[PDB]
Design a protein around this ligand. Structure first.
Ligand SMILES: *[C@@H]1O[C@H](CO)[C@@H](O)[C@H](O)[C@H]1NC(C)=O
Ligand SMILES: *[C@@H]1O[C@H](CO)[C@@H](O)[C@H](O)[C@H]1NC(C)=O
Ligand SMILES: *[C@@H]1O[C@H](CO)[C@@H](O)[C@H](O)[C@H]1NC(C)=O
Ligand SMILES: *[C@@H]1O[C@H](CO)[C@@H](O)[C@H](O)[C@H]1NC(C)=O
Ligand SMILES: [Ca+2]
Ligand SMILES: [Ca+2]
Ligand SMILES: [Ca+2]
Ligand SMILES: [Ca+2]
Ligand SMILES: [Ca+2]
Lengths: 363, 363, 363, 363
């Protein structure tokens, strides 16, 4: 085994094709399946896995019950496999999780009991992190980023989003190798969703407090970091008011509330978003020439990927292969499902970028 | 791993013995199984796999619904395994698929969304192919042929069969390495089912337009190709009128409509067909001394392999082993099933050729 | 991998302990399980497998139907695993089967269609055997014996048991390496169940014609063979009349009918049998000092292994390990079950010999 | 493979974090799962397994039936997997079991039929042990201890607890390599639960006769052994009266009855116990500076791990890895469950020690 190394240069992306689609994205879910929530995807050098948080089996769960965070566990499955009892791999106990593969073992961060974080490397507990700022900690709920055997993840603390604190942790073989406070003051940065290019990790957060755009974060291996705010009238977050003119300030109108989502910075740049913030129906992703951080930059192409489906969280992931100089970039989108008889499991659909332009398709 | 090399010389075939039979070919299907359609078989050097297109699970599907191509996904399973959720391997999104293993990875061609073709090599998307002549593209719906690390497949374009266009593609490690237009004019050539011998690939198509016989195609690595029409009163296609005298022309009577099926050219030659084109009941295969392309050649032995079973598509496949100088040849046949309560999944039965003659048997 | 070599010297056996017990031997069988018949056990150097013939799934099968040999298929499972759809390994098509592992692949003999035998080595069809003496052939329905990379099995031919013919086949890497006709005249020898010791294979047959004792057969690698008849008033077969005095003739009273069962020849010798031939209840095994072929020899110890259970076929098998100079010997016994709602699947219990004496136990 | 070697020095334990939790510990159990009893955990160098004794499947079992020891079988599963039919591994026939992995194979001791003990090494029967003192034998119902390729286990004999006898057995590659009678007179010592440190094995028994504290046992490779009685007013057993002053005698009040549980002796020492002996609700573990065997020693910290759950047996186990000089120590607790419709399966929750102090949590 060899430390996971990611490609320094990103693939040109001009289009998107689905690489995976759960069976609940179209039909109903069999009752025997585990009910999932907080799905995401994270890849090893061998394969891509779908992590999630269990709500219990659909058959042993009655509708009248609301189920509760303390009862929740973190499971894994191979992306492409359905969450049947036999496919499930128990990962840890918790109601929130993030994970990444360094090239040796899986590192998994879970939030449990009190609201602290267990860190487990290859299934065994190597470290715990405790809340200072009070109230429960919170993980990215997205793949963390490993490069050269050290992994980077962002952890949130605090009673409310008005009062949140965020630390950027560095992990090695499952133990914390230090961290840095991120200066958040005046705004809020939750559920960051991240990728790596050109020696820097680039994360799209979610502002649940005072913002209908998405804060953006750049940092490198030495923890020198800057927050950037996108200067485009295309509002990523949900809910949100209305599209605006471009400006490098933050859009405070309907800024409160939010759901996890991404933006991609590159040669081409992308913003994905929920189409109808009322009904939560549809998902669109939208292309831009040059940076998201210039007020100068121009909308080009809008792909309405999903129309008929109730959408929620979305996030990025990078699969790792020899491939070539090119680093592939993919993203997932969680979708409302229902069990054969009621119940609100979610399922996944994933897209990968192609260099080619693509035709208009509703999946 | 070593590039898949097929035997230059074909095994003498004088009979057929079944090597596999789905549980739906006899009893009813358990509701928890995935409903399948467009089944075929393709072999690696390690094993044979059964590909198919999902209609959803039988328990989560209600009868009153008709299901639709856009919801459909291409799965794989090991031949001999039943399509339980735990056995399935997600392969791609699409409503039509063909595949073949080059000795390294599986190549899979799927048709999805707009009606274009994704090509995926070892599960990742390496290439796409888009329709020029308009309307959806169409795959062999049969194993494609790999020899020496390059794979050959045939792709159909066009709004209607009167107007169809066919390209013969060449693929390497999942990217297209060029193609050639096949001259189809005056006829139509769908769902080719192919094998390899004596330095040539030989494919039996299905003419859905103006023919009750089956077009036949020979081509080699340099894409020099010729279409041949069989000169025998034994009508392959379905439906069809009646058996005729031998002639090297095409039988236009009841030539319209059709279903996928094969012919074998060799020392001994074979034509398989559905017995009762009205009821679609029964499958017979029929031996001939010498070519199918001489008007001279004589019927010899008729094997009625299936009598009690409702039949549909049929196709060839070559398993690959060291074995000997001899290249084994097998074929599958798709059979109507039903779930434990209604629903029309299909199952497979497969036959392999033996050198020996065989007694009369209804399987 | 190395050619399977069996121990020349047999373990001293003075008692029996169960090593495995199906869940149907106690409670009822879950409807989703495959219904089995003609269960037996055969071991590789890696593991022991349970072979059987399917009657279909218990949920998809209705009671009013009687199911038929032509619909039957041969499955394998790992001994200790239940025949769930996910555990099943399709082995061949047929209603009767025998198998043995040579140290490289599994050899399986199946009887199908016309009533001929397919021979498959490692899942592929290497050879077929056809009936001369008319009517369907018949396999041991018990593990065949492999030693030093050649395998030995016994095949029956003939319209009725009055008129049976038996050949002793030799197989290598799945092809027949010849056979010998066994001189059966005047009696009948079905379902032989065999083991290997002291350079000789020793088979206990079942006489369905004119005998309430069990024919016994000795042969070696060169196919020199003798039939012996046990000279003991303990009647192995079922049904049977009554226990007799000892004589080296054959007991013709109630000699007709029969069911597969064994005898063990050694320092100690064993005869196992169904206790109550009327109700088919119970199974006892019974120890003897010295040979079964001397009228001199004395009953010693009677173990009543099963009392409450409806019994049927029983057979031997030798597991292979390094262990020591000692060759272990075990046997299985097939037991009537019922599905959660009617239906007559069978399950297995197996016993292995220990050197120690054992207490009286009803399992 | 290499003989399993355990760490001489124990990890400092100042807190406990759950590493696994069964789905029945929170929700209801799906009916298709096997009903379990006598759960425990034992680890190999590869993985930890969960052993248990089957009551049959939840779907095929009706409530009105009480099920009986003779029908019971010993299964295994990988810790973290659910006891679905497809996950189960058949281990032996019996109603009571203990197991441990020496570094080569699993050794499993089972009690069946008459009440004797089968010993199976790597799934094959290597030895049996019979009762002298009459009445059924009994196993630890807990992981036995392997170190350097020899394994140690404790076996109970006798009609009643007033009259019990206990031998300490030594096993190698599955055969008994001798034993020693433990001097129990005047008390009783059942279901010992054990770990290894500092060249000694340390076991916490349960006195079902005359004691509300828990006997404690120290022995080494040469079988030199001493019984110690803990000198602390914290009563381990259940039921029990009331907490007392500290003294080195045994607490006779409500001494009768009992259930399996543990104590840890170390730098820090621990007693775990059921919180409310009436209702059997809740589990607390309690920390002590220095030995449990001095009247001098002081309660320090009480962790209430479980509050809302009905508790039963609890036991230790040591997972084995390279880790470091530190030998990890974990324990499991069995918890009442219920199937989707009635029935009293049990599930597991396991805790591992951390060096760090931990916050108060109700899991
Ligand atoms: C982490 O483990 C890798 C192999 O897993 C090893 O090469 C490296 O030295 C380890 N790093 C630390 C900080 O222990
Ligand atoms: C195709 O793949 C094989 C490895 O499977 C490799 O050695 C060869 O370089 C590849 N050729 C091309 C054109 O990609
Ligand atoms: C059979 O295969 C073995 C290896 O399994 C080989 O060594 C031997 O030469 C083979 N013989 C025949 C006749 O196929
Ligand atoms: C136990 O097993 C190992 C091989 O795995 C062997 O070398 C060792 O000698 C055995 N010990 C005994 C007492 O048989
Ligand atoms: Ca917002
Ligand atoms: Ca036609
Ligand atoms: Ca399963
Ligand atoms: Ca008889
Ligand atoms: Ca007590």
């Amino acid at each position: 085994a060899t430390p996971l190394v990611l490609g320094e240069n990103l693939c040109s992306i001009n289009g998107w094709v689905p690489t995976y689609r759960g069976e609940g994205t179209t039909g109903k879910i069999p009752d025997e399946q585990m009910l999932t929530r907080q799905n995401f995807v994270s890849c090893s050098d061998k394969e891509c896995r779908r992590f999630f948080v269990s709500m219990g089996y659909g058959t042993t769960t009655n509708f009248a019950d609301l189920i509760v965070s303390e009862q929740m566990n973190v499971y894994s499955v191979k992306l492409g496999d359905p969450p049947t009892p036999d496919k499930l791999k128990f990962e840890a106990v918790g109601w929130s999780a993030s994970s990444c593969h360094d090239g040796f073992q899986w590192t998994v961060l879970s939030v449990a009991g009190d609201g602290f974080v267990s860190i487990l490397y290859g299934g065994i507990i190597t470290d715990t992190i405790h809340p200072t700022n009070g109230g429960p900690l919170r993980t990215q709920a997205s793949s963390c980023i490993c490069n050269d055997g050290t992994c980077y993840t962002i952890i949130a603390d605090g009673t409310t989003y008005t009062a949140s604190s965020h630390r950027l942790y560095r992990l090695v073989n499952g133990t914390s190798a230090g961290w840095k406070a991120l200066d958040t003051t005046g705004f809020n940065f939750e559920f960051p969703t991240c990728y790596y290019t050109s020696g820097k990790v680039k994360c799209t957060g979610t502002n649940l407090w005072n913002d209908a755009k998405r804060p953006f974060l750049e940092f490198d291996q030495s923890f020198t970091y800057t927050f950037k705010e996108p200067c485009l009238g295309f509002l990523g977050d949900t809910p949100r008011g209305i599209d605006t003119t471009n400006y490098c300030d933050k859009t405070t109108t309907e800024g409160e509330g939010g759901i996890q989502g991404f933006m991609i910075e590159g040669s081409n740049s992308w913003i994905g978003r929920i189409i109808n913030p009322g009904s939560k129906k549809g998902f669109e992703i939208y292309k831009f020439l040059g940076t998201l951080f210039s007020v100068q930059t121009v909308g080009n192409r809008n792909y309405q990927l999903l129309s008929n489906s109730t959408i929620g969280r979305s996030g990025l992931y990078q699969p790792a292969y020899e491939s070539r100089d090119c680093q592939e970039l993919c993203f997932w989108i969680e979708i409302a499902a229902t069990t054969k008889a009621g119940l609100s499991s979610n399922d996944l659909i994933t897209f990968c970028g192609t260099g080619g332009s693509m035709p208009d398709v509703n999946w």
